């Protein structure tokens, strides 16, 4: 069930309340939540 919400979550200067993960070393289990934030090692030379 989907519906657009611009009444609230798009501010005058833009919204900065919601986030997402760009690229993850491991995949995601079906129905599992990812709440772990860390500097993802894109290459070698650990961060």
């Amino acid at each position: 069930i989907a519906w657009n919400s611009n009444n609230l979550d798009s501010k005058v200067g833009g919204n900065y309340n919601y986030l997402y993960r760009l690229f993850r070393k491991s995949n995601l289990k079906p129905f599992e939540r990812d709440i772990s934030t860390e500097i993802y090692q894109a290459g070698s030379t650990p961060c």
Partner: protein, 44 residues
Amino acid sequence: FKYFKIYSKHTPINLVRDLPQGFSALEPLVDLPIGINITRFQTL
């Protein structure tokens, strides 16, 4: 231990020590879905 379904059954043992004979099956009791993985477990 298996959405955590806890299969339970009460066994009326009457002995001193290491497992006697006699048997039953095991009935599920309650389901609380944790939603995240489990790695270990311990008894206090």
